[PDB]
Design a protein around this ligand. Structure first.
Ligand SMILES: OC[C@H]1O[C@H](OC[C@H]2O[C@H](O[C@H]3[C@H](O)[C@@H](O)[C@@H](O[C@H]4[C@H](O)[C@@H](O)[C@@H](O)O[C@@H]4CO)O[C@@H]3CO)[C@H](O)[C@@H](O)[C@@H]2O)[C@H](O)[C@@H](O)[C@@H]1O
Ligand SMILES: OC[C@H]1O[C@H](O[C@H]2[C@H](O)[C@@H](O)[C@@H](O[C@H]3[C@H](O)[C@@H](O)[C@@H](O)O[C@@H]3CO)O[C@@H]2CO)[C@H](O)[C@@H](O)[C@@H]1O
Lengths: 103, 102
């Protein structure tokens, strides 16, 4: 009831992940300004971020960004819908759709 | 009387051997297809230049391993042809076919 964890998987075609990070903000039920979250791990798809937020969230915004906004990978705001304080998504470079199962 | 399709294909495993394209005309005629091989490569992965000596507005495509050992996305998909040309980008396990480089 007081924490949300989102696992984000990210794949780039060149395999070069240095500096890329995730700008994530609470949308629902209570909106807040965002913060930056770093990748923590790796798997065969690319990098993995385990993002922990100290509230029970049903929706967050996300942008994939290079360092402190040097670039965005998909420039528009996107969102992740969350059930029971846990979600897991897969994001591909330059692909707008956020996937809820591994391609 | 010519259709040229450039197909770009990315696999996140980097293992492209044996993958090929089954492409068939769909409008204004439908015919049995043929296999087309990847001819080249770039930073996104493999490239196939597919030429069909017919005027077409639509073709079907399946990405397959060898002679139907597997399909990467196991439903028929289609490419729209514009003024006799198409260039698309296909990603492993992603249903949507893209008409600009991701
Ligand atoms: O007015 C105060 C306000 O505070 C919070 O809402 C702030 C803000 O939250 C949301 O903004 C998102 C943007 O939509 C999203 O693009 C991104 O902004 C990035 C840019 O994309 C970068 O280009 C660069 O400029 O940096 C910014 C981040 O600083 O992230 C923000 C959130 O951080 C929302 O969409 C906006 O409407 C909101 O103003 C409270 O939630 C809100 O209740 C309160 O009113
Ligand atoms: O006249 C032949 C046929 O053309 C069109 O069929 C296409 C299929 O829809 C399409 O799936 C693909 O079929 C292949 C299968 O997917 C594959 O598993 C395996 O069986 O090989 C098949 C190809 O030999 O391609 C064909 C075109 O070649 C059209 O949809 C049919 O209605 C039509 O009968």
């Amino acid at each position: 009831f007081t924490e949300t964890t989102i696992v984000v998987h990210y794949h780039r075609y060149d395999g070069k992940y240095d500096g890329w990070n995730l700008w994530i903000w609470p949308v629902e039920p209570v909106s807040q300004e965002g913060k930056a979250y770093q990748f923590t791990g790796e798997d065969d798809f690319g990098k993995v971020a385990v993002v922990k937020l100290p509230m029970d969230l049903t929706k967050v915004g996300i942008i994939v960004r290079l360092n402190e906004w040097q670039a965005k990978d998909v420039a528009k705001d996107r969102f992740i819908e969350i059930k029971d304080g846990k979600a897991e998504v897969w994001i591909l470079q330059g692909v707008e759709e956020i996937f809820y199962e591994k391609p």
